[PDB]
Paper text:
CmnC is an α-ketoglutarate (α-KG)-dependent non-heme iron oxygenase involved in the formation of the l-capreomycidine (l-Cap) moiety in capreomycin (CMN) biosynthesis. CmnC and its homologues, VioC in viomycin (VIO) biosynthesis and OrfP in streptothricin (STT) biosynthesis, catalyze hydroxylation of l-Arg to form β-hydroxy l-Arg (CmnC and VioC) or β,γ-dihydroxy l-Arg (OrfP). The overall structure of CmnC shares similar folds with canonical non-heme iron oxygenases. The catalytic iron is bound by the 2-His-1-Glu facial triad comprised of His148, Glu150, and His295.
Five high-resolution crystal structures of CmnC in free form (CmnCapo) and in complex with l-Arg (CmnC l−Arg), l-hArg (CmnC l-hArg), α-KG (CmnCα-kg), and l-Arg/α-KG (CmnC l−Arg,α-kg) were solved at resolutions of 1.49–1.83 Å. An asymmetric unit of either the apo form or the complex forms of CmnC contains two polypeptide chains in a dimer form, which is consistent with the analysis of size-exclusion chromatography. The structure of CmnCapo was then used as the phase model for determining the CmnC complex structures. The superposition of CmnCapo and the complex structures, CmnC l−Arg, CmnC l-hArg, CmnCα-kg and CmnC l−Arg,α-kg, shows relatively small root-mean-square deviations (rmsds) of 0.105–0.168 Å for Cα atoms, suggesting that CmnC does not undergo a significant conformational change upon binding of l-Arg, l-hArg, and α-kg. However, a flaplike domain (Pro201–Ser233) adopts two structural modes within two polypeptide chains from the CmnC dimer, implicating that CmnC may undergo conformational change while the reaction proceeds.
Author numbering:
A (entry chain A): 0 to 338
B (entry chain B): -12 to 205, 216 to 338
Amino acid sequence: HMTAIREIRLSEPESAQAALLALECAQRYAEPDSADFLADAAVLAHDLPRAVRREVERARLDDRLHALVVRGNDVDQDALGPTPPHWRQARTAASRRYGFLLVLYASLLGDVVGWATQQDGRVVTDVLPIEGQEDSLVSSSSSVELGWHTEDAFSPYRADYVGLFSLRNPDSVATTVAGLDPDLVGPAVVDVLFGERFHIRPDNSHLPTHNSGGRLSDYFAGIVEAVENPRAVSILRGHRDAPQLCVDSDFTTAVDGDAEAAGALDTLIKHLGGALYEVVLGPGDVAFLDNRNVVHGRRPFRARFDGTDRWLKRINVTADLRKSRAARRDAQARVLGEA
Amino acid sequence: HHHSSGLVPRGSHMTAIREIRLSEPESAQAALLALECAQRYAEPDSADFLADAAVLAHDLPRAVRREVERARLDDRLHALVVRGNDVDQDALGPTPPHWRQARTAASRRYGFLLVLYASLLGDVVGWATQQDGRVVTDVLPIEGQEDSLVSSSSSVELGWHTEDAFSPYRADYVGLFSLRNPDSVATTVAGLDPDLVGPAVVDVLFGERFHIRPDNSHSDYFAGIVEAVENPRAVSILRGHRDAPQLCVDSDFTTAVDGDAEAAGALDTLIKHLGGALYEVVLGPGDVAFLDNRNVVHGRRPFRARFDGTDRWLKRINVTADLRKSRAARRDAQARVLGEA
């Protein structure tokens, strides 16, 4: 589909209008995931520029979308200061405005959520290279490619959209994206991928090693259960003309003894691995990946660890907050796995 | 004629009814937006309008949008009620004798306004088997269906249910826009208060121990509808968090699984509880309600239809929080009619 990537470039006035709204939110509320802000966010998002809201709404109802990309938001690089050396230190005063703006864009597409087992249950999370994580399989990697995956592929509560706000990307490091064309794998493999014949385990970002050590063991009980005893699940679901995709290149296996399923997974990985294409998010570019339609990753790069490194804000968006209520502490709570 | 909003409790449900009263300026703003939409778009459920509806809805009065957004995230809501929209009774003309004659030029502006309010809560959908797959449907009494089990009834109690209880694609909200209601006829509403029911009965209702069949009201889709009557799936009546369970039950079309006497018991306990807990919502002309179909059953009590063009008349809509999830049951990405293909 020619419109699989939908791009809006902000005019200077539209950029200024989005920046002023984000700064008004920063003046009113403490954190971009403060409960009072999140309660108000869907209505505050309505004050974003009309031309932007029109294009976001076209993207939201496009069931073949790969990504909506909003180019040219204002980022004051001098005021932002250095790229933090760890996500734990990335909730900086100077970066609050970008957190608020990411939530406002996201709230046009649905309701923002976080995970108890990712970056200590923060709703606005940070993607930046960490010294000693170069060769890890998590978003803080650099030297090793971030393997392509559906975000939280293991979970029935996985996001409908993943939002990425690029604060800085001096070496133009590419995000990687792929969808599945059913006609190009054959109806034989599509039939197999629709079967509950696969195990999808949680990725390494959900491990205690990528959260603060003081976090309750019991936050991880659900993750540990999903690693040890994965449910038999499909990779494709929904309409044959527009199937949803759910797979993680590093954490998906066929069920033991299902040679036909193992073959279809092998075929899918080769198809997606090759079709995987690049989107570069420059400073002030915001992307929303349709997590029902595409896998994503990130190209390998060399981090300088001098405060100049690539830095994205990330958010998960659900079309239907109500459906995850069994996994949330209370009605307004946005952190999946607190129940 | 000032703006006001508040929480109206029913039993232990402290936010059961979220009520909004429009100011005269808010009513005029909403009316002007609906009239502008009626000038620029073919139909309140045409593809051109529905592609834009969620953005146009952002032009409704801000104070109303804040209160609607609070209702949308209230997982214990029964009914959001917005009172005081403009209805020009003289210009509207008589209540049509049948829904087939009810998509009138004079009533278009009210269909547009219902869709604008609905689009603050989610995406509007219809059903291939209901009023020719119209998204904006019509509720009015039909002569010769006084004693019918459907929304065109009058003399007989419309028996209460979750809307489309049998279906995994059932609406999150049912919307009603009252055009006229001279005898103050009510919608009946009930939710479960788990503090009034034995915990053991609640545990049974969470079990996949029930059959919910379609009404006779209701092809890969229609193959599923025949199977739904003949070989119904074992489903639960309650689902989700114990602190905020969703309800799905039909007083006339729900049974326990063959041989499950305990489930038969729990079901009849629930039917007696909801029957006893029914309360009424009356919508005057220009009053709009959204029932949270995840939380409440609804019905209607007997009333006296004259069939002289003065009868009660509402516009009705179904809203889903997640349009994408029903794509297997819709014709194409933008089509809103469940079971169309």
